[PDB]
Ligand binder design. Structure first.
Ligand SMILES: COc1nc2ccc(Br)cc2cc1[C@@H](c1ccccc1)[C@@](O)(CCN(C)C)c1cccc2ccccc12
Lengths: 75, 41, 38, 45, 223, 74, 132, 75, 75, 75, 75, 75, 75, 75
């Protein structure tokens, strides 16, 4: 069958969307180091941004894994 | 056919001879490219 | 792509050279900026 | 280059208004004492 | 059928592509007078502001091209702007014309860097503070890019006017298709075409200034 | 000159030389240039009337292509 | 390692003291200053200055202008033209004079004499946020 | 049926466009941590530009998930 | 069959080019947060540059949906 | 035909390169926002660099549309 | 056998998402240099952020190599 | 038959490496704008580096475009 | 055969992962120049991070050149 | 043949790794402008870090071009 062969290239291409949430977490936790070394008195508030920014970045990255596990198995 | 010297070449004299001299050396390169491209077609 | 039809290239090369090098420049040599007076 | 620097002012004029503002917000227990310890008396010829 | 606006135009069997390439200089009148009309007053000002931009960065030998590199930004900025008119055949979408403006101005720029001052032009391939042990790799870059700069110019301008016209012509055909469909959508596809026409006006000038700046920067590196 | 003549001989009266019709353009240009462009306080309509006569020419040769896109046939 | 020096024109708060961190309101944006901080030199804008003693205990003064200058030998010299501790300012006059400043701007249109209002506005805007 | 097999690699490759909206939400919330460390007085107005900049970058990401859900389900 | 199939492989692989417009809109509205926290008096001059930098991202995002259209419909 | 079908894959893959130039126009028009909030007196000389940076980055995207159209139409 | 040959493509294309992490680790350890060259007396706490960032991006770089090993062998 | 069909896919993939130069030339001219606004008295020497950077990033992109053609036309 | 063909497409699409180990090595040595020009008194300690960052981003690039030389030579 | 065919998609997709060294040379020579606009008295030491970063990022580009010219002519 070819669909079983197309679902593999369909999934193995969807997981490339994770390459965005891997360079987007290095820019959030990389801008916490630059932002905290300047004003280290806001560590408990700059952090609570680097968690919102890290959750809204892996979210758009786990969609491409949910899509992969939606093409590969679940129709 | 006068003033083709006076209006058309007398002004462009210091440029077509001294300044754009190396332009024409390049314009020969270009003509060789255009004919060659049209030769292989 | 019709840019590749090389049969009409010499129709675009020569009237350009007759404009970029002889007609547009001639009209620039007529635009002169005199130095200001005292 | 801030807006006042574009508006012609200088940091001395910037500091004269910011320091005046702090004193203008001091409480009356200290406002009288603080204004005379920093008031101006010099005059230009 | 889609690239129709780029085929060499002919009327009554005559190659009308010559009366279109020779027209731009007709929009630049000149006068010997001292106080003329609004057109030549605005034009002689633009030529003053333009020449002071491209040419100020040059030395005395590079400023002898101040007629070429100004009469070139005036010919590309007027050919592009005369292409935005409806149905117009802009000859800057032609790889032939663009290769004829790019190769001479480039070849005539490196020649004067090789026929004279060559020993100095040999030092741009090797940057100043360069350690040695990996030079046999850098020599490829500074030459193979030099050998492809003349094709970078002619294609940066061809592929930017062509693609700018293709887009405006497609988005145009969109508004035509959704015209007989929900009309409040036609007005949003149309307002995209208006913002796109204001962009193709700017890129009509920018692609003329960048072409004549990169020919300037090549010249500045050879005089 | 025409606009006051009436004869078909005028068509053959004219100087149809390579230098003849040029002087009819160079005089047809300076009659336009002096009217709309070469005046102080001139308006943009000296130009937006050349482009309007440049589209009709840019459309005239481009009609052999647009005819293949009519939405009717009669 | 740090040699703080905080001084009004008429008063000295610290002098050669060894605090571990200061948080100053520089014109180019606030920054905190620990030992061996990169040498800089700035000019303040109205705002707090928190001084962290070695014990981790703070101290909060409200500077109004001046110039901090971190040096190459980890020495700091913070000079405020008017540095009053928060126990001397009131919230009512700040909010009131800010209103007298904001309401007087709209009635003004000259670039110079309106620029002096915004500086009074931000100086009072920085006051209400410092008190509470 | 090489028809529905190509509709898998289509959705599978059209969803790689989300790798932009993953590295764009990283630079919005990354440069909010930096910009808020400098001028923490504008905490409210900066966060109103993050939400505006996060959505405009995530919109361009959902348009890929909308396209991947057309080549896969619609046609 | 393969000709009408090779389009979804080419169309979907062409709407990836709008990923670059998801990162270009991040960096634009990510620098409006940094540039405004620095000079909060130019809030209306900067925001007009962000709208300019945002619009010019759709421009290069449309060049892709064009080739994603031609491959799909006007082959 | 496999030869005319492979044109749609290459043409659709060639135009992915527009993701690059779509991300370098956000850097330029994002740097203009930063560099203009620091020296707003240079507004005209900075914008004369956002223009050169726009056209020289965008140009690299159209070199991909060149091969997107050199393949799709002119073999 | 067109499916076993397809696994070499889906598994060789899923592993390009790692190119996202590898670019979000150079941002982290390039922000540790900019944030340590400013306030070096924070070397302890900065490095405990350049590890939380290194271990959160490089986790996304492993979710790709997880699917690359899920198609190549687990099927 | 397929030997030529593969030269339209291998050449459509080789030409997407230009996207690395659409983002490089943006970073070079996004730094000539920032760096200038800080030290506007070095315009002659910053521009002399933005050109060296624009030429060296473009020189990498055009290697891809040359392998695009050296596959599509030579062998 | 069909396998020895796909083994070249998988080993080719996997070594694209190096494209993330080239943008990391760029950002690390891009911050070593910015961080050392700000605080040149830390030349030996900033450079001791630009070697860690160089080796840790290039370790994710080897992970792709390894999975390439696994489909290409091992299996 | 299917070997001479797939060896063109392989060697045609392996050379996308140069997209890394395109944006790695743009950052090194981009931050050199920012590293010089700050400390112009180090012009000899900065430019020696740019050439080190330009030769180590491009070397990752060559490792990709080396593979594309390995699965094409070598074997
Ligand atoms: C609103 O969005 C825009 N803003 C712009 C801003 C500036 C410029 Br100059 C162009 C803009 C263009 C548009 C859209 C548009 C709307 C209508 C017609 C044409 C274009 C768009 O092109 C989005 C572009 N992105 C996503 C690549 C689009 C295209 C195709 C299908 C769409 C479907 C749904 C939504 C948007 C769709």
């Amino acid at each position: 069958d070819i669909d079983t062969a197309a679902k593999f290239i369909g999934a193995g291409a969807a997981t490339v969307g994770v390459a965005g949430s891997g360079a987007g977490i290095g820019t959030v936790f990389g801008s916490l180091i630059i932002g905290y070394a300047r004003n280290p008195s806001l560590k408990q508030q700059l952090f609570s941004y680097a968690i919102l920014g890290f959750a809204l970045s892996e979210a758009m990255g786990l969609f491409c894994l949910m899509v992969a596990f939606l093409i590969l198995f679940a129709m | 056919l006068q003033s083709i010297i006076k209006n058309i070449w007398i002004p462009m004299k210091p440029y077509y001879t001294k300044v754009y001299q190396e332009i024409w050396i390049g314009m020969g390169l270009m003509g060789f490219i255009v004919y060659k491209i049209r030769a292989a077609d | 792509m019709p840019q590749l039809n090389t049969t009409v290239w010499p129709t675009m090369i020569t009237p350009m050279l007759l404009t970029l090098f002889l007609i547009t420049q001639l009209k620039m040599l007529n635009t002169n900026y005199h130095l200001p007076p005292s | 280059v801030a807006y006042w620097r574009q508006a012609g002012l200088s940091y001395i004029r910037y500091s004269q208004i910011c320091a005046k503002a702090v004193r203008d917000a001091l409480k009356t227990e200290f406002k009288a004492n603080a204004e005379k310890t920093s008031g101006s008396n010099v005059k230009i010829v | 059928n889609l690239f129709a606006s780029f085929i060499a135009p002919t009327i009554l069997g005559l190659p009308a592509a010559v009366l279109i390439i020779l027209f731009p200089p007709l929009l630049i009148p000149t006068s010997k007078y001292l106080i003329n009309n609004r057109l030549i007053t605005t034009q002689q000002w633009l030529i003053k502001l333009t020449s002071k931009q491209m040419m100020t960065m040059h030395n005395t030998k590079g400023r002898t091209w101040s007629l070429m590199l100004v009469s070139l930004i005036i010919f590309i900025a007027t050919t592009n702007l005369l292409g935005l008119l409806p149905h117009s055949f802009t000859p800057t979408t032609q790889l032939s014309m663009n290769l004829a403006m790019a190769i001479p101005l480039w070849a005539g720029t490196v020649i004067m860097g090789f026929r004279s001052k060559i020993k100095n032009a040999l030092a741009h391939f090797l940057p100043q503070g360069t350690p040695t042990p990996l030079i046999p790799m850098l020599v490829i870059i500074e030459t193979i890019s030099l050998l492809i700069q003349p094709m970078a110019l002619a294609v940066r301008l061809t592929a930017n006017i062509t693609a700018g016209h293709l887009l405006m012509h497609l988005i145009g055909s969109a508004t035509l298709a959704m015209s007989t469909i929900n009309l409040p959508s036609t007005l949003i596809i149309f307002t995209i075409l208006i913002l796109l026409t204001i962009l193709e006006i700017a890129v009509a000038l920018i692609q003329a200034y960048v072409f004549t700046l990169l020919v300037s920067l090549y010249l500045h590196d050879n005089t | 000159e025409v606009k006051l003549g009436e004869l078909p001989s005028w068509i053959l009266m004219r100087d149809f030389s390579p230098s003849g019709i040029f002087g009819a353009f160079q005089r047809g240009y300076y009659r336009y240039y002096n009217k709309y462009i070469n005046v102080k306080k001139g308006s943009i309509s000296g130009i937006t009337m050349v482009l309007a006569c440049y589209v009709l020419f840019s459309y005239s040769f481009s009609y052999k292509h647009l005819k293949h896109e009519r939405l009717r046939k009669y | 390692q740090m040699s703080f020096t905080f001084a009004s024109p008429t008063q000295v708060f610290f002098n050669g003291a060894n605090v571990r961190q200061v948080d100053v309101p520089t014109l180019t944006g606030a920054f905190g200053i620990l030992a061996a901080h990169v040498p800089t030199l700035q000019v303040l804008r109205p705002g707090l200055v928190v001084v962290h003693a070695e014990d981790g205990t703070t101290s909060k003064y409200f500077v109004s202008s001046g110039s901090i200058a971190v040096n190459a030998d980890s020495s700091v010299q913070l000079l405020a033209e008017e540095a009053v501790t928060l126990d001397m300012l009131d919230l009512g006059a700040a909010k009131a004079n800010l209103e007298k400043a904001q309401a007087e701007l709209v009635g003004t249109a000259d670039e110079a004499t309106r620029a002096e209002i915004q500086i009074r506005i931000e100086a009072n805007e920085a006051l209400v946020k410092a008190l509470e």
